[PDB]
Amino acid sequence: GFDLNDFLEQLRQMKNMGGXXXXXXXXXXXXXXXXXXXXXXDDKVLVRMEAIINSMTMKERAKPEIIKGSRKRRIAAGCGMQVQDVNRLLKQFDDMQRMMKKMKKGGXXXXXXXXXXXXXXXXXXX
Amino acid sequence: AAKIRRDDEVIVLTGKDKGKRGKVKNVLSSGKVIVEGINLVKKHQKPVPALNQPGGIVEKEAAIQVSNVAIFNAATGKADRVGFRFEDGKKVRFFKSNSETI
């Protein structure tokens, strides 16, 4: 299935090649709707991600749903960061579990095409 | 005929800021003004990824009723009240006490 093992290797294979100026120029439809400068700090944030996924025991990665308050104190202490950042990293991983299970069920073309860019009313940004 | 305007230096008569002085950013229609260094509130902001807005407690400046601020006389060092006369053919503001133009 999809774990923080494959997420570990996803983000450590993606911390080699990952950049925000090379990947905000490889899509013309998503850099015109949401702002082109909301991309990322790739080295900071992917070395953060790899740090936080190094702070985990291996069945905490292969079974991400058993991570609770004490586990996040221990992870946030391990790499020298805030419990909230580990919260939002397990958030990001949750979204990617959503997306790759959706890519598992739906054929690659019907889950990459039905992908939607979204605003709260037709007026720009609000 | 509007007494308090943008960029006037004012002094605050009422509230937690009573006695403090500052510079007007802008005015609002409801008779509220927003003054520099005045009436800070601590506001909680849910982090917004589209605007790259971090979260956290932002100290912001909250509108204050324009009745509560007085136009600051720099000459006298006192709060003043304002009036209108016609100099040239133009409508102009002055301080009531020393009756000098602004």
């Binding site: 993606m14 490889x26 991309x39 990322x40 990617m96 990459x112 | 990824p49």
Partner: peptide, 18 residues
């Protein structure tokens, strides 16, 4: 390929606007 471009594109990017 196709699953590496569908990986990386919406990974880097859909981690950006969300």
């Amino acid at each position: 390929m196709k699953q590496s471009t569908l990986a990386l594109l919406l990974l880097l990017l859909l981690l950006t606007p969300v």
